[PDB]
Amino acid sequence: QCVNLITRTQSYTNSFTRGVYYPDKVFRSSVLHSTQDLFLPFFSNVTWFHAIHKRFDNPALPFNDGVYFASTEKSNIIRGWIFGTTLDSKTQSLLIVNNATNVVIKVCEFQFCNDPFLDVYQKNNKSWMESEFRVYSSANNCTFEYVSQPFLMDLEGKEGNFKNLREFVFKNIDGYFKIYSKHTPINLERDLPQGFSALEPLVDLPIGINITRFQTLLALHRSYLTPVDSSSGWTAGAAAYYVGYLQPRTFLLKYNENGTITDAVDCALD
Amino acid sequence: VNFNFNGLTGTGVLTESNKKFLPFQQFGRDIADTTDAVRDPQTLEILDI
Numbered sequence: 001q002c003v004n005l006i007t008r009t010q011s012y013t014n015s016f017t018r019g020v021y022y023p024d025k026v027f028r029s030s031v032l033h034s035t036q037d038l039f040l041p042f043f044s045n046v047t048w049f050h051a052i053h054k055r056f057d058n059p060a061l062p063f064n065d066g067v068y069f070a071s072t073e074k075s076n077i078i079r080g081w082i083f084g085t086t087l088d089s090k091t092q093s094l095l096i097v098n099n100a101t102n103v104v105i106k107v108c109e110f111q112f113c114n115d116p117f118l119d120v121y122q123k124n125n126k127s128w129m130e131s132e133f134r135v136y137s138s139a140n141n142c143t144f145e146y147v148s149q150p151f152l153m154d155l156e157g158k159e160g161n162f163k164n165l166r167e168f169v170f171k172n173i174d175g176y177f178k179i180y181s182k183h184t185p186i187n188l189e190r191d192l193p194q195g196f197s198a199l200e201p202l203v204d205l206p207i208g209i210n211i212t213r214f215q216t217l218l219a220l221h222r223s224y225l226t227p228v229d230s231s232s233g234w235t236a237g238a239a240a241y242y243v244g245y246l247q248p249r250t251f252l253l254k255y256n257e258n259g260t261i262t263d264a265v266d267c268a269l270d
Numbered sequence: 271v272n273f274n275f276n277g278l279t280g281t282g283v284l285t286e287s288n289k290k291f292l293p294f295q296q297f298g299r300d301i302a303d304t305t306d307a308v309r310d311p312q313t314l315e316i317l318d319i
Contacts, residue, residue, distance in 0.1 A: 026295075259289075259290075260292075
């Protein structure tokens with residue numbers, strides 16, 4: 001199956017000092033060192049998407065030289081990732097599923113829909129077990145498989161205030177996909193927090209592929225029943241998330257006695 | 271003693287752990303850019319060179 005939203009219809013904000021990760025796998029204590037690589041430029045225009053959720057989009061996010069993703073979200077409605085160029089079963093592409101049970105890492109040749117998303121899932125007993133599935137529905141010419149721990153923290157956070165923030169960095173160098181993660185506790189409920197933290201390498205996949213475009217996956221119940229109001233409720237404003245591009249410069253850093261990242265300065269800033 | 275830890279080698283004496291590291295952080299390069307701390311390929315024991 002495939003449901004496409006025919007009626008289709010970007011609030012720039014600032015990131016202060018985010019996107020700092022350990023540039024290698026060595027430990028230095030209380031010294032200063034500088035490397036040249038791809039970071040986030042300090043105080044750059046970052047695109048905060050549609051801050052509603054009723055509302056579902058099919059945007060076009062171009063991929064170019066690493067992407068910093070950041071979107072705090074209660075109950076973990078955000079569940080997947082798309083990476084590829086053509087998305088019409090021509091070449092290889094990468095897909096990430098981050099559901100509660102496990103993590104699924106695919107490199108496949110799928111027939112992706114123009115808006116890949118699961119709708120409606122009918123009735124078992126007051127519970128979430130999926131019944132409908134429309135993201136590719138075909139083109140299963142892949143024999144790749146990968147199981148690890150699901151990166152996202154668990155679900156059903158119904159606090160009134162924002163509690164958890166999830167930030168990731170995806171880097172594509174030499175076909176050696178590097179993922180940097182940080183789950184952090186924040187209680188300020190206002191956009192990107194003003195603070196300093198480090199990112200850690202935990203996922204390294206050597207595959208080799210060309211990526212020019214990217215998207216992500218959601219999962220929910222829009223109607224919970226097939227006959228009544230199956231799919232007409234949504235328009236092009238899906239969710240709110242922060243995407244930043246990466247630039248290569250020098251980002252001289254200071255360590256503590258514990259080796260944790262404490263401060264970093266951008267050389268060509270001021 | 272000489273030591274060879276899966277590739278890179280060296281020669282010196284070895285000392286028990288005194289620092290904390292980080293659970294994927296295994297190398298111990300100093301301010302002099304020389305290797306002086308590493309963990310066992312078979313066990314999770316920090317040792318100082």
